[PDB]
Amino acid sequence: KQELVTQNELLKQQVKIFEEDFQRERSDRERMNEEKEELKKQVEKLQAQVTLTNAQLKTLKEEEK
Amino acid sequence: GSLRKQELVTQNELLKQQVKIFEEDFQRERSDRERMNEEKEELKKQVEKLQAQVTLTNAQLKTLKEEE
Amino acid sequence: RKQELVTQNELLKQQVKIFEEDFQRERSDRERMNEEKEELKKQVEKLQAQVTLTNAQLKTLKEEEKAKE
Amino acid sequence: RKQELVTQNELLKQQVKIFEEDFQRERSDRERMNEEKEELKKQVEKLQAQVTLTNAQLKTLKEEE
Secondary structure: OHHHHHHHHHHHHHHHHHHHHHHHHHHHHHHHHHHHHHHHHHHHHHHHHHHHHHHHHHHHHHHHO | OHHHHHHHHHHHHHHHHHHHHHHHHHHHHHHHHHHHHHHHHHHHHHHHHHHHHHHHHHHHHHHHHHHO | OHHHHHHHHHHHHHHHHHHHHHHHHHHHHHHHHHHHHHHHHHHHHHHHHHHHHHHHHHHHHHHHHHHHO | OHHHHHHHHHHHHHHHHHHHHHHHHHHHHHHHHHHHHHHHHHHHHHHHHHHHHHHHHHHHHHHOO
């Protein structure tokens, strides 16, 4: 009994920590994903600007002729 | 007495399988975190370079418009 | 200047190979430091929870003494 | 062939220029990250002091009974 109860209390506590850690990690995996999503939207906006500015320069050179 | 130990034995094996799965999840969760952090460092580097392209082409606009 | 270019292009081709090897080395170092920061973040959450844990025990003790006063 | 070598030569020199510019950019980013790690170290060190302090206040408070 004595070895069996000790291990039962050990593993129950072990799992108790993993579960807490697992839920803590959901929060961290959620935060990091959104941060990435913010960095993707920043890139997407700049990609539009680069396309526009090149077009404006192309039009302005063409108007110069 | 015998039932209580059988119940523990059974419970202890289920917990050693639960511990095994959480430890597999852990190292799996580490590699994802590593992957997603690197992707952020690539996306930040893109922004640096994309901002550079905007300032480059806006400078070119400035110079033409003033030279005109 | 033809042979000068042939010599230089070979030597630059070697230099680009080293730069490319430096780059993947810089990736590995960046990745090591980023996870070390994530290992430190989780330690902060662990430590804060432990502060919370003891402060609860403090509060309970003090509150339980208030009743017995 | 010499035309082909001069093109090649310009591209390799370009390649090198970008590697040398990425090199120097990375130094700043690593230095930034390395300080951000120091800020997180300092926050661990502060909290470890509080964990030690709270445990010791709990111990003396129980002794006060």
